[PDB]
């Protein structure tokens, strides 16, 4: 009475059909650049796994971003490097420019192209309906590409989407939680930011796939169009699913649990309670209505589904009428 298995609807066997060297990152041998090409300029941020700096390549005066890794097992480092190398050149995928050994920490430092990212407060006060559709389409191009390349991102969230708005430029960053998809594999559910975790994670269903990313993207869409970031604000992982259930309802949650024969802690049912499915229109107000259309709500509804198998793929999402004006704009002679 374990759960029912699951496999991706699309891109199921991408890695099955590639040479072992493509996905066997433990066998990757790093070739190191020269740290002395780069001078750190300003610390940007501190995380659990890395410290991030703006830097200059002193041989050409170009800005770059350096992520100095905290000490961790080679295998994790090799996984992120391999993924970044595999995906390099893909649409809106951050470009890994170099890999060096930091001369102070003696840990690897990943050197990326620089994105002049627009501060949050400004984007929040100025993004139009069209801007949201455009950037959503550009994220989807990155996700379709990485999924088609056999990789799940597993940390889609606003902080990992860099936007240089004056150049209409976006990059999906932080590939440190990314992993190769292999059908039938049980993955670690301790991925993604609390607020962007899919229901599969929250009920400990380990045989997930690319569709996790599409849940996370739907949480981003709702936060953007309804002007509430994060949209589903739980105080821990259990309460995260409660906050989802208060919107999607408990009927469809229990139908999902039943479909996959998922067992919940009796206390979990308790806090989940019983909730009607709410209309998306309930979240529309005078301060966000300019960003909301029936197309946006129809699209959001097809991303934010309990059942991972029933979510749109990235390519299906790109064909949604919500993006018709973006597709037109981009159909250019050049
Ligand atoms: C953490 O993984 C990554 C971070 C960044 C940059 N991050 N970042 C920037 S890029 C110009 N600007 N602010 C931050 C930032 C990072 C961590 C905490 C706070 C801010 C890049 Br290019 C690639 C990564 O794989
Ligand atoms: Na240096």
Curated annotation (Swiss-Prot):
One of its GO terms (biological process) is Wnt signaling pathway. Transmembrane segments: none annotated. It catalyses: L-seryl-[protein] + ATP = O-phospho-L-seryl-[protein] + ADP + H(+); L-threonyl-[protein] + ATP = O-phospho-L-threonyl-[protein] + ADP + H(+). Phosphorylation does not directly affect casein kinase 2 activity, but may contribute to its regulation by forming binding sites for interacting proteins and/or targeting it to different compartments. Constitutively active protein kinase whose activity is not directly affected by phosphorylation. Seems to be regulated by level of expression and localization. Keywords: Apoptosis, ATP-binding, Biological rhythms, Cell cycle, Disease variant, Intellectual disability, Kinase, Nucleotide-binding, Nucleus, Phosphoprotein, Serine/threonine-protein kinase, Transcription, Transcription regulation, Transferase, Wnt signaling pathway. InterPro entries: CK2_alpha, Kinase-like_dom_sf, Prot_kinase_dom, Protein_kinase_ATP_BS, Ser/Thr_kinase_AS. Residues 35-40 are annotated as: Interaction with beta subunit. Residues 38-323 form the Protein kinase domain. Expressed in gastric carcinoma tissue and the expression gradually increases with the progression of the carcinoma (at protein level). SMART domains: S_TKc. ATP binds at residues 44-52, 67. Its EC number is 2.7.11.1. It is an enzyme of class 2 (transferase). The keyword Signal does not apply. Belongs to the protein kinase superfamily. Ser/Thr protein kinase family. CK2 subfamily. Can use both ATP and GTP as phosphoryl donors. Phosphorylation by casein kinase 2 has been estimated to represent up to one quarter of the eukaryotic phosphoproteome. Casein kinase 2 has been found to be increased at protein level and up-regulated at the level of enzyme activity in the majority of cancers. However, elevated levels of casein kinase 2 are present in certain normal organs such as brain and testes. Catalytic subunit of a constitutively active serine/threonine-protein kinase complex that phosphorylates a large number of substrates containing acidic residues C-terminal to the phosphorylated serine or threonine. Regulates numerous cellular processes, such as cell cycle progression, apoptosis and transcription, as well as viral infection. May act as a regulatory node which integrates and coordinates numerous signals leading to an appropriate cellular response. PANTHER family: CASEIN KINASE II SUBUNIT ALPHA, CASEIN KINASE II SUBUNIT ALPHA-RELATED. It is linked to Okur-Chung neurodevelopmental syndrome: An autosomal dominant neurodevelopmental disorder characterized by developmental delay, intellectual disability, behavioral problems, hypotonia, speech problems, microcephaly, pachygyria and variable dysmorphic features. This is Casein kinase II subunit alpha. It comes from Homo sapiens (Human).
């Amino acid at each position: 009475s374990g759960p029912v298995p699951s496999r991706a609807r699309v891109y199921t066997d991408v890695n099955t059909h590639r040479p072992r060297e493509y996905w066997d990152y433990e066998s990757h041998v790093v070739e190191w650049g020269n740290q002395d090409d780069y001078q750190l300029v300003r610390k940007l941020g501190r995380g659990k796994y890395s410290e991030v700096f703006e830097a200059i390549n002193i041989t050409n005066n170009e800005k770059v971003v350096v992520k100095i890794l905290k000490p961790v097992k080679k295998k994790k480092i090799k996984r992120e490097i391999k993924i970044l190398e595999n995906l390099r050149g893909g649409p809106n995928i951050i470009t890994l420019a170099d890999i060096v050994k930091d001369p102070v920490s003696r840990t690897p430092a990943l050197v990326f192209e620089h994105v002049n990212n627009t501060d949050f407060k400004q984007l929040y006060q100025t993004l139009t309906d069209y801007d949201i559709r455009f950037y959503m389409y550009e994220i989807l191009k990155a996700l379709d590409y990485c999924h088609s390349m056999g990789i799940m991102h597993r940390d889609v969230k606003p902080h990992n989407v860099m936007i240089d708005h004056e150049h209409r430029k976006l990059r999906l960053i932080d590939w440190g939680l990314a992993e190769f998809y292999h059908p039938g594999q049980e993955y670690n559910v301790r991925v993604a930011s609390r607020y962007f975790k899919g229901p599969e994670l929250l009920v400990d269903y380990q045989m997930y796939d690319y569709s996790l990313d599409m849940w996370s993207l739907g949480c981003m869409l709702a936060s953007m169009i309804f002007r509430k970031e994060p949209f589903f604000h739980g105080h821990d992982n259990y309460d995260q699913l409660v906050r989802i259930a208060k919107v999607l309802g408990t009927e469809d949650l229990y139908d999902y649990i039943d479909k996959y024969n998922i067992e919940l802690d009796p206390r979990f049912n308790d806090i989940l309670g019983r909730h009607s499915r709410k209309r998306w229109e309930r979240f529309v107000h005078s301060e966000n209505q300019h960003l909301v259309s029936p197309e946006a709500l129809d699209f959001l509804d097809k991303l934010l589904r309990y059942d991972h198998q029933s979510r749109l793929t990235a390519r299906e999402a790109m064909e949604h009428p919500y993006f018709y004006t973006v597709v037109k704009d981009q159909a250019r002679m050049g």
